[PDB]
Amino acid sequence: KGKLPPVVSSLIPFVGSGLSFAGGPLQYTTDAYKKYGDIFTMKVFGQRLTFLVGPDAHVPFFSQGDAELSQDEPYQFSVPIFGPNVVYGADLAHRNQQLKFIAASLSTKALQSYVPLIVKEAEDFFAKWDKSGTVDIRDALAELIILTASRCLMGKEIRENLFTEVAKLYQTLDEGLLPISVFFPYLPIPAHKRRDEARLAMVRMFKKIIDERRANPEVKHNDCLQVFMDARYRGEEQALNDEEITGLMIALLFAGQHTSSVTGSWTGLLLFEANNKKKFLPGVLEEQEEIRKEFGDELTMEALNKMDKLHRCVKEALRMYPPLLFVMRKVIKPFSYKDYYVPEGDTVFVSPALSMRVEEVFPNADQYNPERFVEEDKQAQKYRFVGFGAGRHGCMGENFAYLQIKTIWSVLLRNFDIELVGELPKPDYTAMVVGPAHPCLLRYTRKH
Amino acid sequence: KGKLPPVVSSLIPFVGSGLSFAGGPLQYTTDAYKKYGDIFTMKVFGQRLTFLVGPDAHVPFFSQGDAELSQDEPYQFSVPIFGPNVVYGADLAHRNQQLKFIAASLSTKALQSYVPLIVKEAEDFFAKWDKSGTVDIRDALAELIILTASRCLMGKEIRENLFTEVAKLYQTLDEGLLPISVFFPYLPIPAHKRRDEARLAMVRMFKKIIDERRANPEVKHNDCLQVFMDARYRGEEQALNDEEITGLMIALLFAGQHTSSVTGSWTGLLLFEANNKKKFLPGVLEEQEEIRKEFGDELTMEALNKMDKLHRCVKEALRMYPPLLFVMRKVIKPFSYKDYYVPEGDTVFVSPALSMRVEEVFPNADQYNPERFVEEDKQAQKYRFVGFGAGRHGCMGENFAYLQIKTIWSVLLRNFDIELVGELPKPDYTAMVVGPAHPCLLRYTRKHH
Numbered sequence: 001k002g003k004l005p006p007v008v009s010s011l012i013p014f015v016g017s018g019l020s021f022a023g024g025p026l027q028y029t030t031d032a033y034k035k036y037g038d039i040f041t042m043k044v045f046g047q048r049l050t051f052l053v054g055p056d057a058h059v060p061f062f063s064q065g066d067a068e069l070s071q072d073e074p075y076q077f078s079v080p081i082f083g084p085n086v087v088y089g090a091d092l093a094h095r096n097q098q099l100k101f102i103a104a105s106l107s108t109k110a111l112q113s114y115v116p117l118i119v120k121e122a123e124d125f126f127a128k129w130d131k132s133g134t135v136d137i138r139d140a141l142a143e144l145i146i147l148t149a150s151r152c153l154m155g156k157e158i159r160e161n162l163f164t165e166v167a168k169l170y171q172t173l174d175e176g177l178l179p180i181s182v183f184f185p186y187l188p189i190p191a192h193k194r195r196d197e198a199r200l201a202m203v204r205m206f207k208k209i210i211d212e213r214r215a216n217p218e219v220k221h222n223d224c225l226q227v228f229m230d231a232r233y234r235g236e237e238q239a240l241n242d243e244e245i246t247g248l249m250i251a252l253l254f255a256g257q258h259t260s261s262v263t264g265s266w267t268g269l270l271l272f273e274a275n276n277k278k279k280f281l282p283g284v285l286e287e288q289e290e291i292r293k294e295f296g297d298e299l300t301m302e303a304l305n306k307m308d309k310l311h312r313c314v315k316e317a318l319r320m321y322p323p324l325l326f327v328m329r330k331v332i333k334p335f336s337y338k339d340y341y342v343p344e345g346d347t348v349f350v351s352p353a354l355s356m357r358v359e360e361v362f363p364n365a366d367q368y369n370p371e372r373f374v375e376e377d378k379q380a381q382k383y384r385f386v387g388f389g390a391g392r393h394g395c396m397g398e399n400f401a402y403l404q405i406k407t408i409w410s411v412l413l414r415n416f417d418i419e420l421v422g423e424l425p426k427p428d429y430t431a432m433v434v435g436p437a438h439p440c441l442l443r444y445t446r447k448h
Numbered sequence: 449k450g451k452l453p454p455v456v457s458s459l460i461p462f463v464g465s466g467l468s469f470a471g472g473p474l475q476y477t478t479d480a481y482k483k484y485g486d487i488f489t490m491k492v493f494g495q496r497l498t499f500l501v502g503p504d505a506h507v508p509f510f511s512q513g514d515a516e517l518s519q520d521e522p523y524q525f526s527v528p529i530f531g532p533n534v535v536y537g538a539d540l541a542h543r544n545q546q547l548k549f550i551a552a553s554l555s556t557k558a559l560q561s562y563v564p565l566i567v568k569e570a571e572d573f574f575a576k577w578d579k580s581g582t583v584d585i586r587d588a589l590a591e592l593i594i595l596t597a598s599r600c601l602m603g604k605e606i607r608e609n610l611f612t613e614v615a616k617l618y619q620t621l622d623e624g625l626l627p628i629s630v631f632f633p634y635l636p637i638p639a640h641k642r643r644d645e646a647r648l649a650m651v652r653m654f655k656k657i658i659d660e661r662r663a664n665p666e667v668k669h670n671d672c673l674q675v676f677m678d679a680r681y682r683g684e685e686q687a688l689n690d691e692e693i694t695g696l697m698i699a700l701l702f703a704g705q706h707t708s709s710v711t712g713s714w715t716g717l718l719l720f721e722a723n724n725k726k727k728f729l730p731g732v733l734e735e736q737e738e739i740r741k742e743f744g745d746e747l748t749m750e751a752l753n754k755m756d757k758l759h760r761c762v763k764e765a766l767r768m769y770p771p772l773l774f775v776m777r778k779v780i781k782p783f784s785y786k787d788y789y790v791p792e793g794d795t796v797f798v799s800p801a802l803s804m805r806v807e808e809v810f811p812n813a814d815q816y817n818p819e820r821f822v823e824e825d826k827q828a829q830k831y832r833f834v835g836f837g838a839g840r841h842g843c844m845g846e847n848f849a850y851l852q853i854k855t856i857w858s859v860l861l862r863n864f865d866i867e868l869v870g871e872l873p874k875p876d877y878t879a880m881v882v883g884p885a886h887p888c889l890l891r892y893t894r895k896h897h
């Protein structure tokens with residue numbers, strides 16, 4: 001008699017990425033780990049989500065590669081943000097090489113350039129503070145780091161002229177990453193129109209700067225933008241076009257900003273708390289002076305590399321409040337772990353947050369002890385500390401992140417003396433990148 | 449194979465309520481309407497999502513009742529917000545009775561009492577403003593409407609003693625409603641732990657106010673709290689307990705606030721855009737002049753209800769940028785509409801946004817024309833305008849809303865010259881309730897003479 005109305009589409013989105021926007025179920029999963037042990041599963045919309053906790057369990061996740069574990073489906077939200085044929089928009093062939101061009105742009109050689117530029121940038125930034133006040137370091141370090149990134153990662157042109165422009169465009173891309181945007185990246189909604197618009201505006205800006213530089217081999221430049229122009233595929237008359245270069249710029253910002261920003265923020269919020277400051281700031285300050293004795297007052301990479309106690313405080317911030325809570329992969333080729341079997345199609349997760357609160361790995365995991373890392377430096381077992389992931393897809397910007405954040409905090413330890421305003425912040429689980437919840441306040445007093 | 453590891457949870461939640469937190473996909477749904485006509489289905493994770501567009505299609509949605517269409521599944525997320533055995537946390541027996549008390553709290557009789565309170569609050573609020581400047585109208589009216597609502601709904605005591613406390617308790621409860629919260633409302637995450645604590649806190653506070661009123665029993669209070677204290681279920685005639693009354697309060701706050709505050713904001717942002725002001729402000733003012741001349745400078749019920757041209761400026765805001773984008777039901781019993789059959793278990797949507805952009809109903813749909821309702825109000829055909837739903841579960845607050853927004857824009861119009869700053873805001877689809885996007889700014893200057 002009467003028919004069904006027309007079906008327009010049948011959509012079955014990848015559920016995994018929803019954990020980044022589930023509002024921080026670190027509670028619910030710590031329970032599950034403590035009842036069922038280091039491997040366990042959750043069915044949601046008929047999609048198996050298997051979790052891997054602590055070192056042993058990590059091994060299948062981090063030790064395997066692209067034939068066995070896929071990054072494509074979890075990171076598919078990033079394709080329209082960076083553009084087509086860029087990282088997770090490019091076929092495997094092209095992507096592995098595109099990572100090589102990033103790896104080059106952040107190699108030790110490359111950072112040697114950036115360290116003077118990162119140092120000036122921050123010494124100038126922190127000059128403008130008064131003799132006194134109170135300030136939200138999260139907003140502070142966010143400004144600073146976006147500055148520092150434009151200088152190092154986008155060259156001198158964009159930095160000193162067009163920062164405001166680039167800062168707003170980035171802000172629009174970031175504002176185009178709603179919770180829907182991980183399940184339907186291409187859904188036509190105003191936020192995604194605004195996103196795609198700002199992305200093209202970023203390419204425009206970047207064509208001008210490339211073309212200006214196309215005309216003038218008269219200079220060679222010491223920044224990522226140059227590295228991306230000098231990069232070529234295997235054999236190919238294919239160099240990297242304007243869209244592609246821009247993409248990798250945007251991905252360097254998207255990975256760069258928030259993670260370094262919040263970790264920098266957490267580093268200081270934990271150190272200048274009352275109990276922590278008594279126990280750990282003397283260690284840290286002696287070190288800044290002992291570094292001054294030998295190397296001088298200018299911060300160089302040689303000197304930043306010797307700040308072990310400061311490093312350990314950053315790393316302890318990172319251990320306790322990791323900024324990315326879950327890294328994930330779709331299983332292309334099943335594996336075994338202890339008794340268990342993990343099928344094709346599963347989505348495996350490792351949670352830095354969760355794994356670095358395991359007691360048999362990190363004694364007193366609920367408490368701030370940066371000095372715990374003098375013993376970790378003796379353990380040879382892999383995948384104990386996984387804030388920066390590991391294996392072949394682990395964090396390429398790790399040293400950058402440590403240099404940026406140690407520079408920031410060195411310059412603040414030299415010039416100012418600092419106390420935390422009231423209670424330590426609890427983490428804000430709204431956004432994809434977890435940071436301390438505003439307002440995150442630090443009293444600064446100078447010293448002549 | 450080998451041993452599958454411990455599955456600790458298998459869940460398939462109700463997918464439909466996720467459309468409320470989907471970035472405002474009106475584009476997509478409208479592409480689908482224009483291609484497939486006025487009834488069509490999308491599947492997400494297999495679940496059928498059937499949409500009904502325009503007035504013919506609206507009939508199966510609004511004309512049926514609780515036997516045929518269910519509100520349980522789509523409003524599931526709201527249970528932990530209001531509390532247990534409250535509204536969608538209660539069975540139909542107890543729910544429709546609850547809805548019947550709520551209706552008493554919003555009747556023509558009750559509003560007669562409230563309008564003096566609504567007016568006083570508004571005049572005092574705009575009396576604090578400087579000679580001139582710039583205000584964010586939505587921030588502004590959201591503050592006024594919460595103040596006004598605590599007076600009228602929660603009563604004398606709460607408003608003039610511990611406003612700051614309920615306001616931040618409401619803020620917590622609003623903050624425990626994340627996109628994850630529609631799919632999994634009892635997930636133990638900090639935001640839900642903080643929500644549950646704030647709900648319980650509001651009980652405790654309302655136990656205080658209730659017990660002190662009961663020990664002083666001979667006192668008339670004109671407020672929703674009184675009505676709910678005097679309400680009794682059928683047969684047994686048990687009094688509503690402390691947490692049930694608190695629940696009904698929270699539910700009225702969660703209905704009243706954002707929808708009125710955004711609509712009120714739109715009412716003024718549209719009216720004062722340069723073209724729309726040139727075209728339509730003359731008549732609003734001219735209306736206000738004649739009301740004063742006839743009624744005196746007081747704002748009573750009678751004088752507001754005579755404000756037909758302003759009422760249309762608000763009704764038109766609502767037609768174009770309605771705050772609730774989708775109302776939905778779960779089909780208990782199949783039904784036929786023209787050629788078609790919608791089955792048991794489908795989820796049916798009507799989108800006030802979509803359905804009031806349909807040209808065959810609203811000529812020049814994408815155009816600001818308050819005076820369209822001179823003609824449009826004389827239409828015999830039901831379910832044409834649907835900003836407030838209709839039928840069994842249409843908005844019981846329709847009149848409070850218009851009274852509150854008309855009161856607001858009366859005070860503003862009589863006391864200031866107003867201008868819009870730069871671009872008319874595009875709406876923001878990143879909260880559940882949809883409003884104009886910040887910064888949404890009006891320039892003001894008090895009337896000189």
Ligand code: HEM
Nearest residue numbers: 255256259260263327387388389393394395396397400401
């Ligand atoms: C505290 C700061 C940071 C943290 C915690 C962090 C964390 C991580 C993690 C966990 C991964 C692995 C993702 C996965 O395999 O699924 C990763 C990958 C990566 N990170 Fe970071 N990161 C930080 C800073 C940076 C910075 C500053 C940059 C660049 C300027 C950067 C660039 C990258 C890149 C390119 C990868 C991709 C590696 C690949 O897929 O081969 N990161 N990061």
Ligand code: HEM
Nearest residue numbers: 700703704707708711775835836837841842843844845849
């Ligand atoms: C501009 C302001 C408002 C708009 C646009 C609006 C819109 C709506 C809509 C569309 C519905 C139908 C929901 C459905 O069918 O599932 C509804 C129901 C309702 N509204 Fe409103 N509303 C507004 C103001 C208010 C206010 C101020 C209150 C109370 C103080 C209120 C209380 C209710 C109640 C109790 C219902 C439920 C009817 C039921 O389930 O039987 N509304 N509203």
